[PDB]
Design a protein around this ligand. Sequence first.
Ligand SMILES: Nc1ccn([C@@H]2O[C@H](COP(=O)(O)O)[C@@H](O)[C@H]2O)c(=O)n1
Ligand SMILES: Nc1ccn([C@@H]2O[C@H](COP(=O)(O)O)[C@@H](O)[C@H]2O)c(=O)n1
Ligand SMILES: Nc1ccn([C@@H]2O[C@H](COP(=O)(O)O)[C@@H](O)[C@H]2O)c(=O)n1
Ligand SMILES: Nc1ccn([C@@H]2O[C@H](COP(=O)(O)O)[C@@H](O)[C@H]2O)c(=O)n1
Lengths: 140, 140, 140, 140
Amino acid sequence: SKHSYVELKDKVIVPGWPTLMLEIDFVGGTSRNQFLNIPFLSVKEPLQLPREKKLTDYFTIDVEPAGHSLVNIYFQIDDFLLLTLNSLSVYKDPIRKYMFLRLNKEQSKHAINAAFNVFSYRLRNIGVGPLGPDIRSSGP
Amino acid sequence: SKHSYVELKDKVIVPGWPTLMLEIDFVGGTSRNQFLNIPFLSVKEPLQLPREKKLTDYFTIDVEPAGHSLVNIYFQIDDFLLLTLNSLSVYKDPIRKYMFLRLNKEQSKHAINAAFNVFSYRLRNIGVGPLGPDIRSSGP
Amino acid sequence: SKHSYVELKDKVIVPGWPTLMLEIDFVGGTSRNQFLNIPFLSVKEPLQLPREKKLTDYFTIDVEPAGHSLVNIYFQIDDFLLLTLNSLSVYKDPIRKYMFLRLNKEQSKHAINAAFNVFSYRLRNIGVGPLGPDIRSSGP
Amino acid sequence: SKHSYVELKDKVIVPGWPTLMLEIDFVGGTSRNQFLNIPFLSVKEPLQLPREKKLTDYFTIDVEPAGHSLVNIYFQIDDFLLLTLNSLSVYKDPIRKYMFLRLNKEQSKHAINAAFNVFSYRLRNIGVGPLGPDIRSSGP
Ligand SMILES: Nc1ccn([C@@H]2O[C@H](COP(=O)(O)O)[C@@H](O)[C@H]2O)c(=O)n1
Ligand SMILES: Nc1ccn([C@@H]2O[C@H](COP(=O)(O)O)[C@@H](O)[C@H]2O)c(=O)n1
Ligand SMILES: Nc1ccn([C@@H]2O[C@H](COP(=O)(O)O)[C@@H](O)[C@H]2O)c(=O)n1
Ligand SMILES: Nc1ccn([C@@H]2O[C@H](COP(=O)(O)O)[C@@H](O)[C@H]2O)c(=O)n1
């Protein structure tokens, strides 16, 4: 049936927790040319998909223009990954099957200069900094 | 008689449809130096002007400063091209004879650093992404 | 006596008229490193100071931080130059003896990365574009 | 006990006074790769810590993501340094033990592209410009 692509807001990123970086390469290969690194989600446990399976099997993305300078990235997340991410997530199950996040002027120019052509993309686990635990517990 | 240069707003760009990229080269030649790629218009069918005719015959542009950091690009569109674009357009005939679009801080610095001197410019057809059709139909 | 550095706003830049570009070089020499090109003023006639005299004799600038990311450029304009600019100006005599203009996030990073050290600076005349005269007369 | 990381706002930077630049290097070494230079504090006297002691002994920082594009830098300042900075500060003792400052879109991309990994960081004294004294005294 019909759906809507819901927005993955910034609140899903919590300072002090490890992060899942969405890394995108465009026209070339290994940092060959245009790319984007995007803090995607704050997590409790690091993501580690099954041996066999590829991220491409559960994750599909589409970089699209949203104006003369801004760009959005659309997401289609498979149940397995949706379930996975929601259990790792620091923020209460924010992930859905159809999403998108807005890029800023700076991030968008890279997408635009590559005519939105995605070569490869992955989700990398980024550890916490020296004040990480102190930061998240020292709320107001 | 007198006219006004009307603004080509972002609403004319619809995520999920193919796009017409406005590509601009400045002082050098083939990406020799400063350049700009600008999502110009969302289209149903790709643009493909007549054999002979050159884009320069129907299209004239002028990059001008609009402040100490922002720049605007002015357009003068010939009837043939105005008619063409309006029929391809996803958004209801937004194109007029005299227009202009605002560049953002990021895009403007390139224009400024080349003292607004346009060497060449074209309109390229950009295809749709993997979720393209699903994106435009999955409205709210 | 006491004064205030007044702001040189964007309204002094009028699309369609020739411009005076404020060019700044920082730590190195000929585009050796960090630099800034800033549309400074819209003019009717191009600036052309006396044979002998140097711009440095009438113009003094100071790049200063205004926050953790924004920077301002302060100006001290000599009577001769103040008088000159005000007569060339498209906007009604906006120039004063003590001024400053705000840089945007993008422009500021270059100033910041050079620790505000100005090596050289000049005012260059920038001609008008192909639609220049039509642009300024085709007001609303 | 519990605390909050207070924000080091821009008001602590006063145009016309010397500055303390927070310089950060990320994954590589000597400007090897990603870095950040941040106007940190306006001071009356330049900072000059004891012979032996290292800045790392009184200062600890943590670069953390705060959204899909913005980043914050968290600080933990030791009493010695807190006392030092507050006496040099042009703005009335703004420094506290636990702080953080927001980075802008432009500054954040560098932090993000290095996955927030800090290699080294220091506080450099930046002198005043040619109109420095005139600027701070020529208030409104
Ligand atoms: N977020 C970023 C930052 C840089 N880049 C790439 O790095 C090149 C150099 O830009 P930097 O000055 O940011 O290192 C760019 O022209 C672009 O190919 C990118 O594609 N995405
Ligand atoms: N939109 C853009 C992006 C990059 N560029 C060119 O690419 C060079 C490298 O910038 P990037 O880091 O964006 O690749 C710039 O100095 C400029 O000549 C441009 O002219 N317009
Ligand atoms: N407005 C600008 C644009 C570029 N630059 C210089 O050009 C270098 C390459 O940046 P671009 O990608 O903008 O060409 C920068 O690292 C900087 O030294 C500058 O100093 N001021
Ligand atoms: N504030 C800045 C400016 C530049 N840079 C570095 O300088 C490289 C070239 O960027 P510029 O065009 O700004 O000189 C960047 O790819 C990045 O490695 C940085 O890391 N932080």
